[PDB]
Amino acid sequence: VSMRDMLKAGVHFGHQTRYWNPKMKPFIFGARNKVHIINLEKTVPMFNEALAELNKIASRKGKILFVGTKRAASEAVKDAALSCDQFFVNHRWLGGMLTNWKTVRQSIKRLKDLETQSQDGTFDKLTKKEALMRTRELEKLENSLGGIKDMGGLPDALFVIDADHEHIAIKEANNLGIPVFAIVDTNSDPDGVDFVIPGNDDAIRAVTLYLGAVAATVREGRSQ
Amino acid sequence: ELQEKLIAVNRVSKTVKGGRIFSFTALTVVGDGNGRVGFGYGKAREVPAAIQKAMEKARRNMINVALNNGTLQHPVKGVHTGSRVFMQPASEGTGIIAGGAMRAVLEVAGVHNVLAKAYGSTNPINVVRATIDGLENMNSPEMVAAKRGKSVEEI
Amino acid sequence: GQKVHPNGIRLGIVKPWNSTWFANTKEFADNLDSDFKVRQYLTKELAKASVSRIVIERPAKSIRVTIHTARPGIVIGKKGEDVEKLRKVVADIAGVPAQINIAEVRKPELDAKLVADSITSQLERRVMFRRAMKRAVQNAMRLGAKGIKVEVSGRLGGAEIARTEWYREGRVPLHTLRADIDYNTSEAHTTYGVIGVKVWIFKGEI
RNA sequence: CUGCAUGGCUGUCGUCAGCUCGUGUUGUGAAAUGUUGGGUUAAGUCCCGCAACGAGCGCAACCCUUAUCCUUUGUUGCCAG
RNA sequence: AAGGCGGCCCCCUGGACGAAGACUGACGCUCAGGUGCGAAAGCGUGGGGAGCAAACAGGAUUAGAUACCCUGGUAGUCCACGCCGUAAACGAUGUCGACUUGGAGGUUGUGCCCUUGAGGCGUGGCUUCCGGAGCUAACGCGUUAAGUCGACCGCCUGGGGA
RNA sequence: GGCGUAAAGCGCACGCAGGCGGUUUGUUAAGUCAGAUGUGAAAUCCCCGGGCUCAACCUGGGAACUGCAUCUGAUACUGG
C-alpha cells in the first residue's frame, strides 16, 4: 500500500477543473492541463486509517457490502467480494435495498425458490413459454440480487466505488447508522461518507488497487 | 416502558373524477419520561390505522436531550416555519405551564417544570418541530466545559 | 357496475347445484315449489344450528335432504330425536316419504353463509360494524383463505344516510371462472331498517 | 305516503384501461413517487430504463358456441359397396 | 442617478474606468423640511404637417355592434419657448459599508510570456445564466443576496368605503 | 413585528438642520461606573412578627420607593 504503487495506477489523476466539488479542497495538490491532481500524502494516511477499521469490523464477524455500478468497476467488485466471501452489488442499486429491506427480502425469497424449484425439481411442468418466462425472471433477479442473497439481514459496513454515482447507497447508509467507506474523486462530495479515501475511481487499474487492499484486510480479519 | 401521547387528528382530502378521497393524519409523540423524544406523523384512510403508522414513525426517529432535575438547562428559543417557541427553566412545583402541542412534547420528554410560550403560528405539527428544535440544540454545562477546554465554578 | 352472481356463473364448472333432481314438464313447477318449502321450513327451524347449505335430491319417488351445518349436535339433538321429527313434517311438505342426512362443516370461518349469518347476528345486538367486519376477515385469513372481502351496506351505526363500507384481504379474483369463490349474503333486521352483508371467500383455483 | 331513511335487483359513463394499497423515499404540509420516461401492444400489454421495491382489483387467460381431423358408439338417424 | 439615449461629420460639454507615482490628512455615511431632474398623454404662444392616427364619417360583421375588420380622416405625433409632475416611473427589491463555497459566459482596461498563432500566466471595472451553504410561507434569492452584520432614512398595521 | 409576490422602499438625485463616524498619543472628566451624605410624607405594596375564636379587618419592626441633588474616587468605552 505504497505512494509508489498508487502513482503507477493513476490514483493522483482527477477530473477536469470545471467539474470539482470545492468540499474536496483539502485533498488537492493542483492543476496540470486543466485537470486536478489528488494529493497522495493525504490519501495514504487516510487509506491505512480506513483499512484499520475494515480489519476491526471483519474480526468480529460483520458483513461487508461492496458497491460499484460503474461499468469500469463492475467486474472488479464481483471478483473481489468472492475472494473474501462477502456480498456485493454491480447492476442497479435498488432504491431502498437497506431502508426497505423488509420488502426486498421477498425478492430474495423468490430468487431462492426459482434457483431450487428449477435445478432440483427441475420444473418439467412447462408450457414452454413458462419454462423460459421463469428463466427470464431468474436471470433478471440474479443480476439485481445475486450478490446480497446470502446476507440474511443488514450489513455492518459499505464500500463504495465513486461517491457521486452511488449517492443513493451512501444516503441510505446514513439513515441506518452504518459506517461508509468511499473512493472520492475531485468531482465528488465527502459529507455523508464516514471514512473518505480520496482517489481516482474512473480508471480500472486504479480500482483494482483499492479492492486488492480491502480483499486482503477482510480475509486477514475473517481468519483471525 | 415508554409514554406516548396523541396530539392531533386532521382529516385531509384529495380530489378526483369521482369526488373526494378523505384521509386522516395523526400526530404523536413518544418518550421515555427522561430525556428522549420522537414525534411521528402517519396518514391512512382509517383513523386507528394512522395513529399506528405515527407511533411506529415516532419510535425510530427519536433524540436525546440533557435535562437537569426534570427541567431545562437554560432558556432556549426554537423555530420552524411559522412557529416560534420560547421555553425557560422553572423552579420546582411550577408544573408544565405551556400551550397545546408544546405541553404533550414536554410531558413525555420528562420535563416537569417549564415556562413555555408559543408565538407565531400554533400549527400543531410545526410547533412540535420547533419545540424539539429547541430542546436538541440546548446544551449542558458538561458539554461547554469540553468545548472551551475548562471545568470551572461555571460548573 | 353490477356484478354477475359469482355462484351462478360458476355452476357446472367448479360449483355444483343444490337441487339435483330430474323432472319432465308436468312435475317441474311442483318439485320447485316443494323444494322451496322444505328449505323455507328448515331455515326457520335450524336458525341457531348454523346451516350453510341444504342440498335436495329426488331418487325414485322419495325426497332426500342433505344438510350442511357447523353444529351436527344441535340438529341431531339426542339419539336423533330431532332429525326424526324433522322428517315427518318434511314428508308432509314434499308429500313423498323423506330422508334427512347431515354433514359437518369443519371450518365455519370459511363458509360464506355462516360468516355472513355471524356478522348479521352481531349487527342485531348493536355491535360496532367495523369490528364485526374486521374480526371476520382476520379469522378467515389465519385459517388459510387465499382471500376474502366483506361488504356491509345501508345505515351503519344508525346514520340517516346509507353507505357501504367494504374490506378485502388477500386475493379475490371474480373474473376467473376456475376460481372457487364461495359467496353468500344476509339481511340484518335492525331498528334502522335493513343492513345487507355480502361475503366472498376465495379458497384457491381449479 | 316516503327510492331524499333502507336492503335486494337494474341502467349509465364503459369491455373504457384504468383504479388503488403496503413498505421505502422526497416535501413544514396538502401531497408526490411508484402509476412517469424510451420503445411497443387491443390492453398500467410486454421489454428497457428510473428512489423506488412489491402487492391487489381490473386487461389477458380459465367457460359456452362456431371452423378441420381422430377415437368410440349406430336407432327412431345414414345408404357407399 | 433615474426618465432615457441609435445614420455620418464638426463645435461646446458631463461622468466612469485602468496603470504607476505624487499630493491633502477623516475632509466621511445618511438625510425630515428644501431645491433640482423626471416617459407618454395633455395644456399655452408661434411655426410645421410626409407618414401614422384618438375624435368623426361611410362600409362590413352581428340578435344588436355606439367595437374588433375595411375605406377615409381632425387633434395629436415634429420644431422653438413655457407649463403639467404622473406610469406595472418595476429588479414590483431605499442609500452606504464590511464579511461568507463554486461553474459557465459576455464587455472593457492593464501587467508578466521560444508576443512565435486568432495564443500561455495573472490583475482591475461593469454585466448574463446556472447553482452550494444559508435564508424564505413557499415560489425562489443565492458574493450584483432575499445569506451574516452595522449606519441613516422612507413606509405598513383586516376587506370594502377610499 | 415587518416591507420581491400577502399591507408596506418616495420615480431618481442633490443637499441644510438632525443621527452616526476610521486609527494613534496626551489631556478633560460631560455621558458612564463605584462609594458616601441629604431627601424621596404617612398610609398602600412585599417580608418577618403581634392582636381580634379563624378569616377579612387592625397593628409592631423591616425591606422597597428602581428617582433627584451634593461630595469623593475610577477613566475601558462615548463625548470635549
mmCIF file with all atom_site columns, N, CA and C (backbone and C1' of nucleotides) in Angstrom, chain F residues 2-3 5 8 25 27 32 34 38 42 44 48 53-54 56 59 69 73 80:
data_model
loop_
_atom_site.group_PDB
_atom_site.id
_atom_site.type_symbol
_atom_site.label_atom_id
_atom_site.label_alt_id
_atom_site.label_comp_id
_atom_site.label_asym_id
_atom_site.label_entity_id
_atom_site.label_seq_id
_atom_site.pdbx_PDB_ins_code
_atom_site.Cartn_x
_atom_site.Cartn_y
_atom_site.Cartn_z
_atom_site.occupancy
_atom_site.B_iso_or_equiv
_atom_site.pdbx_formal_charge
_atom_site.auth_seq_id
_atom_site.auth_comp_id
_atom_site.auth_asym_id
_atom_site.auth_atom_id
_atom_site.pdbx_PDB_model_num
ATOM 1   P P     . G F 1 2  ? -39.624 40.036 12.214 1.00 0.00 ? 2  G F P     1
ATOM 2   O "O5'" . G F 1 2  ? -40.563 40.127 10.925 1.00 0.00 ? 2  G F "O5'" 1
ATOM 3   C "C5'" . G F 1 2  ? -40.236 40.948 9.779  1.00 0.00 ? 2  G F "C5'" 1
ATOM 4   C "C4'" . G F 1 2  ? -41.463 41.678 9.283  1.00 0.00 ? 2  G F "C4'" 1
ATOM 5   C "C3'" . G F 1 2  ? -41.337 42.308 7.908  1.00 0.00 ? 2  G F "C3'" 1
ATOM 6   O "O3'" . G F 1 2  ? -41.497 41.321 6.892  1.00 0.00 ? 2  G F "O3'" 1
ATOM 7   C "C1'" . G F 1 2  ? -42.376 43.829 9.397  1.00 0.00 ? 2  G F "C1'" 1
ATOM 8   P P     . C F 1 3  ? -40.446 41.218 5.684  1.00 0.00 ? 3  C F P     1
ATOM 9   O "O5'" . C F 1 3  ? -40.828 42.461 4.782  1.00 0.00 ? 3  C F "O5'" 1
ATOM 10  C "C5'" . C F 1 3  ? -41.923 42.370 3.883  1.00 0.00 ? 3  C F "C5'" 1
ATOM 11  C "C4'" . C F 1 3  ? -42.154 43.721 3.278  1.00 0.00 ? 3  C F "C4'" 1
ATOM 12  C "C3'" . C F 1 3  ? -41.017 44.267 2.439  1.00 0.00 ? 3  C F "C3'" 1
ATOM 13  O "O3'" . C F 1 3  ? -41.031 43.654 1.148  1.00 0.00 ? 3  C F "O3'" 1
ATOM 14  C "C1'" . C F 1 3  ? -41.884 45.958 3.840  1.00 0.00 ? 3  C F "C1'" 1
ATOM 15  P P     . U F 1 5  ? -43.675 43.183 -3.399 1.00 0.00 ? 5  U F P     1
ATOM 16  O "O5'" . U F 1 5  ? -44.361 41.845 -3.911 1.00 0.00 ? 5  U F "O5'" 1
ATOM 17  C "C5'" . U F 1 5  ? -44.969 41.840 -5.206 1.00 0.00 ? 5  U F "C5'" 1
ATOM 18  C "C4'" . U F 1 5  ? -45.633 40.521 -5.460 1.00 0.00 ? 5  U F "C4'" 1
ATOM 19  C "C3'" . U F 1 5  ? -46.719 40.149 -4.473 1.00 0.00 ? 5  U F "C3'" 1
ATOM 20  O "O3'" . U F 1 5  ? -47.923 40.730 -4.954 1.00 0.00 ? 5  U F "O3'" 1
ATOM 21  C "C1'" . U F 1 5  ? -45.250 38.312 -4.814 1.00 0.00 ? 5  U F "C1'" 1
ATOM 22  P P     . A F 1 8  ? -49.004 47.402 -0.612 1.00 0.00 ? 8  A F P     1
ATOM 23  O "O5'" . A F 1 8  ? -47.733 48.059 0.084  1.00 0.00 ? 8  A F "O5'" 1
ATOM 24  C "C5'" . A F 1 8  ? -47.820 49.374 0.672  1.00 0.00 ? 8  A F "C5'" 1
ATOM 25  C "C4'" . A F 1 8  ? -46.755 49.539 1.722  1.00 0.00 ? 8  A F "C4'" 1
ATOM 26  C "C3'" . A F 1 8  ? -45.335 49.375 1.210  1.00 0.00 ? 8  A F "C3'" 1
ATOM 27  O "O3'" . A F 1 8  ? -44.951 50.656 0.718  1.00 0.00 ? 8  A F "O3'" 1
ATOM 28  C "C1'" . A F 1 8  ? -45.675 48.085 3.194  1.00 0.00 ? 8  A F "C1'" 1
ATOM 29  P P     . U F 1 25 ? -2.645  54.434 21.671 1.00 0.00 ? 25 U F P     1
ATOM 30  O "O5'" . U F 1 25 ? -1.961  55.777 22.192 1.00 0.00 ? 25 U F "O5'" 1
ATOM 31  C "C5'" . U F 1 25 ? -0.528  55.916 22.285 1.00 0.00 ? 25 U F "C5'" 1
ATOM 32  C "C4'" . U F 1 25 ? -0.142  57.350 22.589 1.00 0.00 ? 25 U F "C4'" 1
ATOM 33  C "C3'" . U F 1 25 ? -0.828  58.019 23.771 1.00 0.00 ? 25 U F "C3'" 1
ATOM 34  O "O3'" . U F 1 25 ? -0.350  57.598 25.050 1.00 0.00 ? 25 U F "O3'" 1
ATOM 35  C "C1'" . U F 1 25 ? -0.721  59.539 21.965 1.00 0.00 ? 25 U F "C1'" 1
ATOM 36  P P     . U F 1 27 ? -2.011  62.238 30.307 1.00 0.00 ? 27 U F P     1
ATOM 37  O "O5'" . U F 1 27 ? -3.064  63.435 30.263 1.00 0.00 ? 27 U F "O5'" 1
ATOM 38  C "C5'" . U F 1 27 ? -2.666  64.794 30.540 1.00 0.00 ? 27 U F "C5'" 1
ATOM 39  C "C4'" . U F 1 27 ? -3.732  65.777 30.106 1.00 0.00 ? 27 U F "C4'" 1
ATOM 40  C "C3'" . U F 1 27 ? -5.072  65.698 30.830 1.00 0.00 ? 27 U F "C3'" 1
ATOM 41  O "O3'" . U F 1 27 ? -5.052  66.384 32.087 1.00 0.00 ? 27 U F "O3'" 1
ATOM 42  C "C1'" . U F 1 27 ? -5.437  65.814 28.490 1.00 0.00 ? 27 U F "C1'" 1
ATOM 43  P P     . U F 1 32 ? -25.272 58.894 32.677 1.00 0.00 ? 32 U F P     1
ATOM 44  O "O5'" . U F 1 32 ? -24.184 57.736 32.609 1.00 0.00 ? 32 U F "O5'" 1
ATOM 45  C "C5'" . U F 1 32 ? -24.254 56.718 31.604 1.00 0.00 ? 32 U F "C5'" 1
ATOM 46  C "C4'" . U F 1 32 ? -23.032 55.831 31.659 1.00 0.00 ? 32 U F "C4'" 1
ATOM 47  C "C3'" . U F 1 32 ? -22.698 55.245 33.018 1.00 0.00 ? 32 U F "C3'" 1
ATOM 48  O "O3'" . U F 1 32 ? -23.573 54.161 33.268 1.00 0.00 ? 32 U F "O3'" 1
ATOM 49  C "C1'" . U F 1 32 ? -20.732 56.106 32.056 1.00 0.00 ? 32 U F "C1'" 1
ATOM 50  P P     . A F 1 34 ? -22.516 51.115 39.447 1.00 0.00 ? 34 A F P     1
ATOM 51  O "O5'" . A F 1 34 ? -21.276 51.430 40.395 1.00 0.00 ? 34 A F "O5'" 1
ATOM 52  C "C5'" . A F 1 34 ? -20.322 50.406 40.717 1.00 0.00 ? 34 A F "C5'" 1
ATOM 53  C "C4'" . A F 1 34 ? -19.342 50.905 41.747 1.00 0.00 ? 34 A F "C4'" 1
ATOM 54  C "C3'" . A F 1 34 ? -19.933 51.454 43.039 1.00 0.00 ? 34 A F "C3'" 1
ATOM 55  O "O3'" . A F 1 34 ? -20.352 50.420 43.923 1.00 0.00 ? 34 A F "O3'" 1
ATOM 56  C "C1'" . A F 1 34 ? -18.255 52.908 42.284 1.00 0.00 ? 34 A F "C1'" 1
ATOM 57  P P     . G F 1 38 ? -27.816 61.273 56.002 1.00 0.00 ? 38 G F P     1
ATOM 58  O "O5'" . G F 1 38 ? -28.450 62.415 55.097 1.00 0.00 ? 38 G F "O5'" 1
ATOM 59  C "C5'" . G F 1 38 ? -28.435 63.793 55.514 1.00 0.00 ? 38 G F "C5'" 1
ATOM 60  C "C4'" . G F 1 38 ? -29.028 64.661 54.432 1.00 0.00 ? 38 G F "C4'" 1
ATOM 61  C "C3'" . G F 1 38 ? -30.475 64.365 54.055 1.00 0.00 ? 38 G F "C3'" 1
ATOM 62  O "O3'" . G F 1 38 ? -31.466 64.825 54.978 1.00 0.00 ? 38 G F "O3'" 1
ATOM 63  C "C1'" . G F 1 38 ? -29.203 64.567 52.092 1.00 0.00 ? 38 G F "C1'" 1
ATOM 64  P P     . A F 1 42 ? -42.812 58.039 54.925 1.00 0.00 ? 42 A F P     1
ATOM 65  O "O5'" . A F 1 42 ? -44.252 57.943 55.596 1.00 0.00 ? 42 A F "O5'" 1
ATOM 66  C "C5'" . A F 1 42 ? -44.424 57.811 57.016 1.00 0.00 ? 42 A F "C5'" 1
ATOM 67  C "C4'" . A F 1 42 ? -45.887 57.931 57.375 1.00 0.00 ? 42 A F "C4'" 1
ATOM 68  C "C3'" . A F 1 42 ? -46.771 56.760 56.962 1.00 0.00 ? 42 A F "C3'" 1
ATOM 69  O "O3'" . A F 1 42 ? -46.671 55.613 57.813 1.00 0.00 ? 42 A F "O3'" 1
ATOM 70  C "C1'" . A F 1 42 ? -47.818 58.791 56.344 1.00 0.00 ? 42 A F "C1'" 1
ATOM 71  P P     . U F 1 44 ? -50.884 50.319 55.480 1.00 0.00 ? 44 U F P     1
ATOM 72  O "O5'" . U F 1 44 ? -51.028 50.359 53.893 1.00 0.00 ? 44 U F "O5'" 1
ATOM 73  C "C5'" . U F 1 44 ? -52.323 50.422 53.250 1.00 0.00 ? 44 U F "C5'" 1
ATOM 74  C "C4'" . U F 1 44 ? -52.170 50.394 51.745 1.00 0.00 ? 44 U F "C4'" 1
ATOM 75  C "C3'" . U F 1 44 ? -51.383 49.217 51.190 1.00 0.00 ? 44 U F "C3'" 1
ATOM 76  O "O3'" . U F 1 44 ? -52.248 48.104 50.970 1.00 0.00 ? 44 U F "O3'" 1
ATOM 77  C "C1'" . U F 1 44 ? -50.637 51.241 50.184 1.00 0.00 ? 44 U F "C1'" 1
ATOM 78  P P     . C F 1 48 ? -42.704 35.683 55.252 1.00 0.00 ? 48 C F P     1
ATOM 79  O "O5'" . C F 1 48 ? -42.157 36.047 56.701 1.00 0.00 ? 48 C F "O5'" 1
ATOM 80  C "C5'" . C F 1 48 ? -40.802 35.773 57.098 1.00 0.00 ? 48 C F "C5'" 1
ATOM 81  C "C4'" . C F 1 48 ? -40.483 36.469 58.406 1.00 0.00 ? 48 C F "C4'" 1
ATOM 82  C "C3'" . C F 1 48 ? -41.476 36.290 59.543 1.00 0.00 ? 48 C F "C3'" 1
ATOM 83  O "O3'" . C F 1 48 ? -41.363 35.019 60.174 1.00 0.00 ? 48 C F "O3'" 1
ATOM 84  C "C1'" . C F 1 48 ? -40.863 38.559 59.414 1.00 0.00 ? 48 C F "C1'" 1
ATOM 85  P P     . U F 1 53 ? -62.839 37.393 68.875 1.00 0.00 ? 53 U F P     1
ATOM 86  O "O5'" . U F 1 53 ? -62.110 36.003 68.593 1.00 0.00 ? 53 U F "O5'" 1
ATOM 87  C "C5'" . U F 1 53 ? -61.352 35.322 69.617 1.00 0.00 ? 53 U F "C5'" 1
ATOM 88  C "C4'" . U F 1 53 ? -60.992 33.908 69.196 1.00 0.00 ? 53 U F "C4'" 1
ATOM 89  C "C3'" . U F 1 53 ? -60.549 33.713 67.754 1.00 0.00 ? 53 U F "C3'" 1
ATOM 90  O "O3'" . U F 1 53 ? -59.134 33.875 67.719 1.00 0.00 ? 53 U F "O3'" 1
ATOM 91  C "C1'" . U F 1 53 ? -62.174 32.067 68.349 1.00 0.00 ? 53 U F "C1'" 1
ATOM 92  P P     . C F 1 54 ? -58.428 34.586 66.478 1.00 0.00 ? 54 C F P     1
ATOM 93  O "O5'" . C F 1 54 ? -58.842 33.659 65.256 1.00 0.00 ? 54 C F "O5'" 1
ATOM 94  C "C5'" . C F 1 54 ? -58.112 32.460 64.951 1.00 0.00 ? 54 C F "C5'" 1
ATOM 95  C "C4'" . C F 1 54 ? -58.509 31.951 63.590 1.00 0.00 ? 54 C F "C4'" 1
ATOM 96  C "C3'" . C F 1 54 ? -58.288 32.909 62.432 1.00 0.00 ? 54 C F "C3'" 1
ATOM 97  O "O3'" . C F 1 54 ? -56.938 32.849 61.983 1.00 0.00 ? 54 C F "O3'" 1
ATOM 98  C "C1'" . C F 1 54 ? -60.427 31.892 62.261 1.00 0.00 ? 54 C F "C1'" 1
ATOM 99  P P     . A F 1 56 ? -56.759 37.420 56.431 1.00 0.00 ? 56 A F P     1
ATOM 100 O "O5'" . A F 1 56 ? -57.773 38.611 56.098 1.00 0.00 ? 56 A F "O5'" 1
ATOM 101 C "C5'" . A F 1 56 ? -58.167 38.943 54.745 1.00 0.00 ? 56 A F "C5'" 1
ATOM 102 C "C4'" . A F 1 56 ? -59.600 39.440 54.690 1.00 0.00 ? 56 A F "C4'" 1
ATOM 103 C "C3'" . A F 1 56 ? -59.833 40.900 55.076 1.00 0.00 ? 56 A F "C3'" 1
ATOM 104 O "O3'" . A F 1 56 ? -59.581 41.878 54.068 1.00 0.00 ? 56 A F "O3'" 1
ATOM 105 C "C1'" . A F 1 56 ? -61.414 39.555 56.192 1.00 0.00 ? 56 A F "C1'" 1
ATOM 106 P P     . U F 1 59 ? -54.115 50.349 61.456 1.00 0.00 ? 59 U F P     1
ATOM 107 O "O5'" . U F 1 59 ? -53.111 49.497 62.352 1.00 0.00 ? 59 U F "O5'" 1
ATOM 108 C "C5'" . U F 1 59 ? -52.751 49.916 63.672 1.00 0.00 ? 59 U F "C5'" 1
ATOM 109 C "C4'" . U F 1 59 ? -51.826 48.911 64.316 1.00 0.00 ? 59 U F "C4'" 1
ATOM 110 C "C3'" . U F 1 59 ? -50.385 48.910 63.826 1.00 0.00 ? 59 U F "C3'" 1
ATOM 111 O "O3'" . U F 1 59 ? -49.598 49.958 64.388 1.00 0.00 ? 59 U F "O3'" 1
ATOM 112 C "C1'" . U F 1 59 ? -51.165 46.685 64.010 1.00 0.00 ? 59 U F "C1'" 1
ATOM 113 P P     . A F 1 69 ? -30.035 65.447 39.065 1.00 0.00 ? 69 A F P     1
ATOM 114 O "O5'" . A F 1 69 ? -29.594 66.036 40.475 1.00 0.00 ? 69 A F "O5'" 1
ATOM 115 C "C5'" . A F 1 69 ? -29.649 67.451 40.710 1.00 0.00 ? 69 A F "C5'" 1
ATOM 116 C "C4'" . A F 1 69 ? -29.404 67.752 42.164 1.00 0.00 ? 69 A F "C4'" 1
ATOM 117 C "C3'" . A F 1 69 ? -27.951 67.702 42.615 1.00 0.00 ? 69 A F "C3'" 1
ATOM 118 O "O3'" . A F 1 69 ? -27.222 68.834 42.145 1.00 0.00 ? 69 A F "O3'" 1
ATOM 119 C "C1'" . A F 1 69 ? -29.290 66.596 44.197 1.00 0.00 ? 69 A F "C1'" 1
ATOM 120 P P     . G F 1 73 ? -11.014 63.323 45.007 1.00 0.00 ? 73 G F P     1
ATOM 121 O "O5'" . G F 1 73 ? -10.803 61.747 44.948 1.00 0.00 ? 73 G F "O5'" 1
ATOM 122 C "C5'" . G F 1 73 ? -10.639 61.055 43.703 1.00 0.00 ? 73 G F "C5'" 1
ATOM 123 C "C4'" . G F 1 73 ? -10.948 59.594 43.904 1.00 0.00 ? 73 G F "C4'" 1
ATOM 124 C "C3'" . G F 1 73 ? -10.838 58.729 42.659 1.00 0.00 ? 73 G F "C3'" 1
ATOM 125 O "O3'" . G F 1 73 ? -9.491  58.314 42.467 1.00 0.00 ? 73 G F "O3'" 1
ATOM 126 C "C1'" . G F 1 73 ? -12.964 58.432 43.593 1.00 0.00 ? 73 G F "C1'" 1
ATOM 127 P P     . G F 1 80 ? -16.745 65.029 20.199 1.00 0.00 ? 80 G F P     1
ATOM 128 O "O5'" . G F 1 80 ? -16.263 66.051 21.318 1.00 0.00 ? 80 G F "O5'" 1
ATOM 129 C "C5'" . G F 1 80 ? -17.101 67.159 21.691 1.00 0.00 ? 80 G F "C5'" 1
ATOM 130 C "C4'" . G F 1 80 ? -16.461 67.937 22.811 1.00 0.00 ? 80 G F "C4'" 1
ATOM 131 C "C3'" . G F 1 80 ? -15.142 68.610 22.471 1.00 0.00 ? 80 G F "C3'" 1
ATOM 132 O "O3'" . G F 1 80 ? -15.341 69.832 21.764 1.00 0.00 ? 80 G F "O3'" 1
ATOM 133 C "C1'" . G F 1 80 ? -14.983 67.538 24.574 1.00 0.00 ? 80 G F "C1'" 1
#
